[PDB]
Amino acid sequence: LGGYMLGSAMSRPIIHFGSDYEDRYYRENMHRYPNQVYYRPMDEYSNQNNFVHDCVNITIKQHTVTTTTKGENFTETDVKMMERVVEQMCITQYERESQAYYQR
């Protein structure tokens, strides 16, 4: 875990799934959901979506695994839902730290 880092927090984003009900679905669960996302220090990774991709996957993982071991089976849809919301969160947390690189 401590080879990764958690950074700052934010409020939950808002992301349309193509179903006008699937969008509401996660809304009607959003009391919890992820609210912080896991990365590594800026070093070589430079991409847009591709920085986000692992950032998302590892956050999504840590937010699934423990929940699974509490008896809550997030389906494929529950997990894919989180991946979008974590994408926006990981852009935000990515960029927050790009600004701090420029600030040197």
UniProtKB/Swiss-Prot annotation:
Family statement: Belongs to the prion family.
Additional facts recorded: This protein is produced by a bicistronic gene which also produces the alternative prion protein/AltPrP (AC F7VJQ1) from an overlapping reading frame. The alternative prion protein/AltPrP (AC F7VJQ1) and PRNP have no apparent direct functional relation since a mutation that removes the start codon of the AltPrP has no apparent effect on the biology of PRNP. In mouse and hamster, the alternative initiation AUG codon is absent and is replaced by a GUG codon.
Localization annotation: Cell membrane; Golgi apparatus
Subunit structure: Monomer and homodimer. Has a tendency to aggregate into amyloid fibrils containing a cross-beta spine, formed by a steric zipper of superposed beta-strands. Soluble oligomers may represent an intermediate stage on the path to fibril formation. Copper binding may promote oligomerization. Interacts with GRB2, APP, ERI3/PRNPIP and SYN1. Mislocalized cytosolically exposed PrP interacts with MGRN1; this interaction alters MGRN1 subcellular location and causes lysosomal enlargement. Interacts with KIAA1191. Interacts with ADGRG6.
Disease listed for this protein: PrP is found in high quantity in the brain of humans and animals infected with neurodegenerative diseases known as transmissible spongiform encephalopathies or prion diseases, like: Creutzfeldt-Jakob disease (CJD), fatal familial insomnia (FFI), Gerstmann-Straussler disease (GSD), Huntington disease-like type 1 (HDL1) and kuru in humans; scrapie in sheep and goat; bovine spongiform encephalopathy (BSE) in cattle; transmissible mink encephalopathy (TME); chronic wasting disease (CWD) of mule deer and elk; feline spongiform encephalopathy (FSE) in cats and exotic ungulate encephalopathy (EUE) in nyala and greater kudu. Creutzfeldt-Jakob disease: Occurs primarily as a sporadic disorder (1 per million), while 10-15% are familial. Accidental transmission of CJD to humans appears to be iatrogenic (contaminated human growth hormone (HGH), corneal transplantation, electroencephalographic electrode implantation, etc.). Epidemiologic studies have failed to implicate the ingestion of infected animal meat in the pathogenesis of CJD in human.
Effect of D54N: In FFI and CJD
Impact after mutating T64K: In early-onset dementia and dementia due to prion diseases
Gene name of this polypeptide: PRNP
Post-translational modifications reported in the UniProt record: The glycosylation pattern (the amount of mono-, di- and non-glycosylated forms or glycoforms) seems to differ in normal and CJD prion.
Effect of mutating E95K: Confers relative protection against sporadic Creutzfeldt-Jakob disease (CJD) in the heterozygous state
Domain comment, as recorded: The normal, monomeric form, PRPN(C), has a mainly alpha-helical structure. Misfolding of this form produces a disease-associated, protease-resistant form, PRPN (Sc), accompanied by a large increase of the beta-sheet content and formation of amyloid fibrils. These fibrils consist of a cross-beta spine, formed by a steric zipper of superposed beta-strands. Disease mutations may favor intermolecular contacts via short beta strands, and may thereby trigger oligomerization. Contains an N-terminal region composed of octamer repeats. At low copper concentrations, the sidechains of His residues from three or four repeats contribute to the binding of a single copper ion. Alternatively, a copper ion can be bound by interaction with the sidechain and backbone amide nitrogen of a single His residue. The observed copper binding stoichiometry suggests that two repeat regions cooperate to stabilize the binding of a single copper ion. At higher copper concentrations, each octamer can bind one copper ion by interactions with the His sidechain and Gly backbone atoms.
Designated name of the protein: Major prion protein
Residue pairs linked by disulfide bridges in the UniProt entry: C55-C90
Its job: Its primary physiological function is unclear. May play a role in neuronal development and synaptic plasticity. May be required for neuronal myelin sheath maintenance. May promote myelin homeostasis through acting as an agonist for ADGRG6 receptor. May play a role in iron uptake and iron homeostasis. Soluble oligomers are toxic to cultured neuroblastoma cells and induce apoptosis (in vitro). Association with GPC1 (via its heparan sulfate chains) targets PRNP to lipid rafts. Also provides Cu(2+) or Zn(2+) for the ascorbate-mediated GPC1 deaminase degradation of its heparan sulfate side chains.
Sites where a glycan is attached: N57, N73
